[PDB]
Symmetry: D2
Subunit: 270 residues, 4 copies
């Protein structure tokens, strides 16, 4: 057994998938399970809380009340919630895995700054699959990227409010960059009516919105006579939960530093 973890947001959609990824994953022990103050607990965290019962781990509201039973903090909640946890941790030297998105800048500066006293793994997408794909797209842009036509199709469930996906964009920059360009100089997002021919040097984006699709990203580099395509399909949010949980175990032994998934996946040596 090992590394104890505290899963904040235990009853939230992400927090559940985390309890499971933790119980059924070796080298990591479920130390605590938090929650908002003024919400129905359910003691046995992962017990009732996450499908499969048991776990004498009880979903508290404290923190100081748990300081000694978790080595690492996994946070997929809210920027307001996160900043607070970030402050207790940084005081008592607990490392954190941060999957809360949506911080204002002043927000990220906290994290950056806190990362000098404690070890933080903070990332926009915690799916290993998406993280590799991003490195591949790079190598690839470096050969065919140039002289090939480059389009990015992403599909999402019917409740995503913003188009294109933040991953599709992330995919776009990975590529714009590698060819040494700027995504904003060469991106095209809409195609309506008489468009005229496809401007060379541009990166187009198509976005599908339907049913419950969790998340699909495709990149193609099309030439005359051939097409390369790299697709990552997400069938479940558990995909992100294994990534976060694998990162905790990774931060094991670490102190000070801000890392991300490339750090954890060693993708810079790739």
């Amino acid at each position: 057994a090992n590394i104890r973890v505290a899963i904040a947001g235990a009853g939230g959609r992400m927090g559940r998938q985390l309890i499971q990824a933790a119980l059924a994953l070796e080298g990591v022990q479920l130390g605590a399970a938090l929650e908002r103050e003024g919400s129905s607990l359910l003691g046995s965290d992962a017990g009732e809380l996450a499908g499969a019962g048991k776990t004498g781990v009880t979903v508290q509201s404290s923190l100081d009340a748990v300081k000694d039973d978790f080595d690492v903090f996994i946070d997929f909640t809210r920027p307001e919630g996160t900043l607070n946890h970030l402050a207790f941790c940084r005081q008592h030297g607990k490392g954190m895995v941060i999957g809360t998105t949506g911080f204002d800048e002043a927000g990220k500066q906290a994290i950056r700054d806190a990362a000098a006293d404690i070890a933080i793994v903070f990332a926009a997408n915690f799916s290993v699959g998406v993280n590799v794909m991003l490195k591949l797209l790079e190598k690839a842009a470096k050969v065919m990227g140039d002289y090939t036509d480059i389009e990015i199709i992403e599909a999402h469930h019917r409740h995503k409010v913003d188009a294109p996906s933040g991953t599709a964009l992330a995919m776009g920059e990975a590529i714009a960059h590698a060819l040494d360009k700027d995504l904003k100089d060469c991106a095209v997002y809409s195609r309506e009516g008489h468009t005229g021919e496809r401007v060379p040097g541009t990166i187009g984006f198509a976005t599908v919105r339907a049913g419950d699709i969790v998340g699909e990203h495709t990149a193609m580099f099309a030439d005359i006579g051939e097409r390369l395509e790299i697709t990552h399909k997400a069938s479940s949010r558990m995909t992100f939960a294994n990534g976060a949980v694998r990162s905790a175990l990774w931060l094991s032994g670490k102190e000070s530093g801000l890392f991300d998934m490339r750090d954890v996946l060693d993708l810079n040596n790739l």
Copy 2:
């Protein structure tokens, strides 16, 4: 052997694929091969003209000079060219297969009107594959169409000037209709920035533009837990050439009438 055909536009991209589809297709004989006046002929039509030599069929400029050696006229040229052929044919009772697009209304009225003296097969897309797919989409809209999320993705080579494809639209109406709605009341073509959730009852469209893709059309009806998808992929323009050539042989025996591919494919009995 049978039915003699005259392939106008013999040296144009479509006209070539027609000579091949004709020579290598049973029940049809290559009677003539036309062309514009003031263009390099090449006698043996399909001979040099279409990859595989031979054919003592010679690419003339006339029409009256060929009246007696072709039963049917296949035209994939220009509206201006077409109207002329339409006039000789309608006089001397030659049936026609018309794949020229882009007629102004006054244009289509000609065709409509001419179709009372001769038998015409005139259609927007001559691919059998696309024509069936359209009937399927209908049956399908009639069950899941309703309560499912309906998106249409189409991809085309880098030189298509207008987005969405005229087939994608055609796909959209097939569906809007079947559910008894109007495509213009419920179509969404662009998705940029903060979109908000996907409005129910709408039909979205995504359009990819890359390399040399000849033509790809996909329709999905997405629910919670499942997705149906119907895709037609075109790998070569020959796809349209077999459709047109199969239609000539179909118009065999016919006189007066305006038909299309459903007529020919018997899709209304489907």
Copy 3:
């Protein structure tokens, strides 16, 4: 509110998805929730049992003890379990929706026979999506089926023991039949080493086995120059649960008869 249903197998993988499909589906009320004798109940059926708490419906072991609070019986358990339920129902005139597979013949004859006293909806695949797709494949085989190359690819999670899928087969017969042939005369299942060219008139099958894929079925009819493809993707077992639950509400008003999904979906009028 309406039609009361009894969900047998409440704590089994299917039985859960049923409680949800029932609570959140209009015209149907959760009357009972059964289970094996000598298993941990949990009263509030769909409550704890199916993710979302509440439901003063309690998971009993009886049947006579519930006779008066359910109009229809939904069974996704075991042939041995099913035959028993089938016997109580047929006595007290409760209609049934049967999703238990694996009956020996003597088994199906029971069902057939029982269907004269009560109304039964019994089917191999309860996904609407798969059921439509099957009707489409038919219409389609009837046009291009002939002269086109027909292949069927299916993918499943890593724990499916038998290859090809029983749906892929079901897809194969739908097609073999429509062209008036027999699947066993023209099916090819393996392709290894020097195969020789693809025999015309045959239907090939390719089967992928990986990760947690719930279920993917694709049918293509390939010619020279074009391909039609019809794919059904299942993202969750809920897909079958809505189908079964929609069928109960369908059996509302019915007495005697054996039906299936075409019955329910009106696909024979399609």
Copy 4:
């Protein structure tokens, strides 16, 4: 203008696509166009021979008769033909791009040996797209390869005689290797009847055979919750012709050495 090339096999399916790739590609000039002795020439090589007329390049039968008008030899013919060209070249120091497959070992030893006097680029698949994809698969196996389920689907036209594709195999080894295993210890090629669960550690292969598909290769690494997929689609044989022609220009300046596409594409620095 530059580098002169001699395209042997000018009237063969590959030889044509080469004349085009050469004329319409900068830095390369069409020096000669060969052919078998006792076959209808057609002078203007790429002229009639390859769709677009002209080229005062005439399709000879010699070699010594062309020695001084081509710097590089591109051969996509027959092992028997190739060995002969290999012998003239190696004498008179002409570099070669070799796309003829099917040599017996004694055959490859020739090439290997000849490569000490002249510069040879010899490769199994000359598509840039396939060559990159292969490097990507490697990086990728190195992260997710392990603990993920790995399947390879390939589709080909209806006249491929051997299954799985030689690229699919090549894909399999790229991966088996990277994880440091041997493809022959862990490959599964057929899946029929009661298979039992998917053995971990194995690489499965599914093979589709239909219509005129030129060549499709997909690799997926499937986990619980996510799938990565890398696909290369070939729409035309021109895909290989640009690869070969890009290699000639690459061999410009070179003397002695045996290289392949990684050499040319610099993929070992990738």
